[PDB]
Design an enzyme around this catalytic site. Sequence first.
Site, PDB file in Angstrom:
ATOM      1  N   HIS A 182      58.196   2.058  33.843  1.00 34.59           N
ATOM      2  CA  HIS A 182      58.586   2.401  32.493  1.00 34.59           C
ATOM      3  C   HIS A 182      59.853   2.634  32.405  1.00 34.59           C
ATOM      4  CE1 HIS A 182      54.336   3.612  32.162  1.00 34.59           C
ATOM      5  NE2 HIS A 182      54.484   3.783  33.508  1.00 34.59           N
ATOM      6  N   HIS A 219      52.127  -3.776  27.731  1.00 33.22           N
ATOM      7  CA  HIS A 219      52.851  -2.438  27.732  1.00 33.22           C
ATOM      8  C   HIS A 219      53.626  -2.361  28.864  1.00 33.22           C
ATOM      9  CE1 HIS A 219      48.515  -2.017  26.117  1.00 33.22           C
ATOM     10  NE2 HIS A 219      49.409  -1.271  25.336  1.00 33.22           N
ATOM     11  N   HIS A 258      54.795  -0.733  38.681  1.00 31.16           N
ATOM     12  CA  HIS A 258      55.311  -1.379  37.554  1.00 31.16           C
ATOM     13  C   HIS A 258      56.223  -0.132  37.187  1.00 31.16           C
ATOM     14  CE1 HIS A 258      51.958   1.970  36.551  1.00 31.16           C
ATOM     15  NE2 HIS A 258      52.968   2.299  35.522  1.00 31.16           N
ATOM     16  N   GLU A 303      59.448   8.895  32.493  1.00 30.43           N
ATOM     17  CA  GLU A 303      58.281   9.642  32.058  1.00 30.43           C
ATOM     18  C   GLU A 303      58.256  10.846  32.475  1.00 30.43           C
ATOM     19  OE1 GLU A 303      54.713   6.954  32.927  1.00 30.43           O
ATOM     20  OE2 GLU A 303      54.968   6.704  30.653  1.00 30.43           O
ATOM     21  N   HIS A 326      56.410   3.323  39.394  1.00 32.71           N
ATOM     22  CA  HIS A 326      55.212   3.611  39.793  1.00 32.71           C
ATOM     23  C   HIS A 326      54.403   2.996  40.583  1.00 32.71           C
ATOM     24  CE1 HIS A 326      54.830   6.449  35.805  1.00 32.71           C
ATOM     25  NE2 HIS A 326      55.731   6.912  36.608  1.00 32.71           N
ATOM     26  N   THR A 354      49.524   7.722  32.816  1.00 28.17           N
ATOM     27  CA  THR A 354      50.286   8.139  31.748  1.00 28.17           C
ATOM     28  C   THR A 354      50.177   7.262  30.449  1.00 28.17           C
ATOM     29  OG1 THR A 354      51.953   6.771  32.139  1.00 28.17           O
ATOM     30  CG2 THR A 354      51.866   9.198  33.063  1.00 28.17           C
TER      31      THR A 354
HETATM   32  N1  LIG Z   1      51.380   4.785  34.455  1.00 27.02           N
HETATM   33  S1  LIG Z   1      50.243   5.328  35.594  1.00 27.02           S
HETATM   34  O1  LIG Z   1      49.906   6.582  35.351  1.00 27.02           O
HETATM   35  O2  LIG Z   1      51.236   4.958  36.820  1.00 27.02           O
HETATM   36  C1  LIG Z   1      49.124   4.073  35.335  1.00 27.02           C
HETATM   37  C2  LIG Z   1      48.557   3.554  36.608  1.00 27.02           C
HETATM   38  C3  LIG Z   1      47.717   2.778  36.856  1.00 27.02           C
HETATM   39  C4  LIG Z   1      46.727   2.310  35.472  1.00 27.02           C
HETATM   40  N2  LIG Z   1      45.790   1.093  35.331  1.00 27.02           N
HETATM   41  C5  LIG Z   1      45.726   0.362  36.410  1.00 27.02           C
HETATM   42  O3  LIG Z   1      46.423   0.127  37.293  1.00 27.02           O
HETATM   43  N3  LIG Z   1      44.537  -0.677  36.133  1.00 27.02           N
HETATM   44  C6  LIG Z   1      44.232  -1.679  36.864  1.00 27.02           C
HETATM   45  C7  LIG Z   1      42.854  -2.120  36.531  1.00 27.02           C
HETATM   46  C8  LIG Z   1      42.552  -3.341  37.288  1.00 27.02           C
HETATM   47  C9  LIG Z   1      43.215  -3.996  37.976  1.00 27.02           C
HETATM   48  C10 LIG Z   1      44.637  -3.700  38.055  1.00 27.02           C
HETATM   49  N4  LIG Z   1      45.290  -4.503  39.008  1.00 27.02           N
HETATM   50  O4  LIG Z   1      45.077  -5.263  39.611  1.00 27.02           O
HETATM   51  O5  LIG Z   1      46.738  -4.118  39.103  1.00 27.02           O
HETATM   52  C11 LIG Z   1      45.071  -2.637  37.201  1.00 27.02           C
HETATM   53  C12 LIG Z   1      47.394   2.945  34.252  1.00 27.02           C
HETATM   54  C13 LIG Z   1      48.563   3.788  34.412  1.00 27.02           C
HETATM   55 ZN   LIG Z   2      53.093   4.033  35.054  1.00 27.69          ZN
END
Ligand SMILES: NS(=O)(=O)c1ccc(NC(=O)Nc2cccc([N+](=O)[O-])c2)cc1
Ligand SMILES: [Zn+2]
Length: 258
Positions: A94, A62, A92, A104, A117, A196
């Site tokens: 978008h 994604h 990350h 976004e 983000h 999001t």
């Molecule tokens: N697009 S956002 O709203 O910023 C968003 C931020 C975080 C997530 N989810 C994650 O970060 N999940 C996750 C779950 C386990 C481990 C890790 N990680 O090690 O980065 C990440 C999804 C959307």
């Molecule tokens: Zn994000």
Amino acid sequence: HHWGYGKHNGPEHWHKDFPIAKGERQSPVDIDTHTAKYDPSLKPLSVSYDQATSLRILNNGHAFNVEFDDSQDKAVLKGGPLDGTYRLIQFHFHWGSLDGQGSEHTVDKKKYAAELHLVHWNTKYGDFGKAVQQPDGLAVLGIFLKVGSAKPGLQKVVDVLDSIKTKGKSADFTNFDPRGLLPESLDYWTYPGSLTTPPLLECVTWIVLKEPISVSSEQVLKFRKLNFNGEGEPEELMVDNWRPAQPLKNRQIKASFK
Ligand SMILES: NS(=O)(=O)c1ccc(NC(=O)Nc2cccc([N+](=O)[O-])c2)cc1
Ligand SMILES: [Zn+2]
């Protein structure tokens, strides 16, 4: 694993698996700059990334995440609208297929080319998985990207993308300094919202910086060469991985500045 950004599994479909998609505090939103309220009791943001320990970069199908060691207070966000300490777990982006779209959040309906983000979780909840179940579990710092001059601090990220072209690929990504991704000013808008992407949990205090960073056309072009698919599946370019603005409903966006 079903959901995505295509015509048949895109944001307009998400509510069937994730009914909270139509909830009371969904993100992103449009930031109407004239309606946002300056809040003189908001503290300055405290971004402490000097001991940040990046580990790995992963294409998750994604977006791509640069993950950090969040087992100690090494890179934390405090102050602003927040109470307590939030640890950086990943960042990350978008982005769009075209420079005219990709963010976004929007600002007076304006779309930026991309949006960064930086995701943090509230240490009082012990780990990220517990934090996302809490209304104040996460703080995500959002930074707009526009196309212009290159961002030197982004280049190390751009240069590893060839090693994580397809879903499920990861590469070592140590010693990356996320301070190189920040604009000069930390003036921000803030409101309560959600992740999001599915599961769209309503656990995020959004802190969105007023000042965008500039990245080069070559830098964002390299984002657009990534793939949503796995190796050996049909090539689908990873572009337009953004959710559009959702209704503000019963929320007021606050500004740290006038
Ligand atoms: N697009 S956002 O709203 O910023 C968003 C931020 C975080 C997530 N989810 C994650 O970060 N999940 C996750 C779950 C386990 C481990 C890790 N990680 O090690 O980065 C990440 C999804 C959307
Ligand atoms: Zn994000």
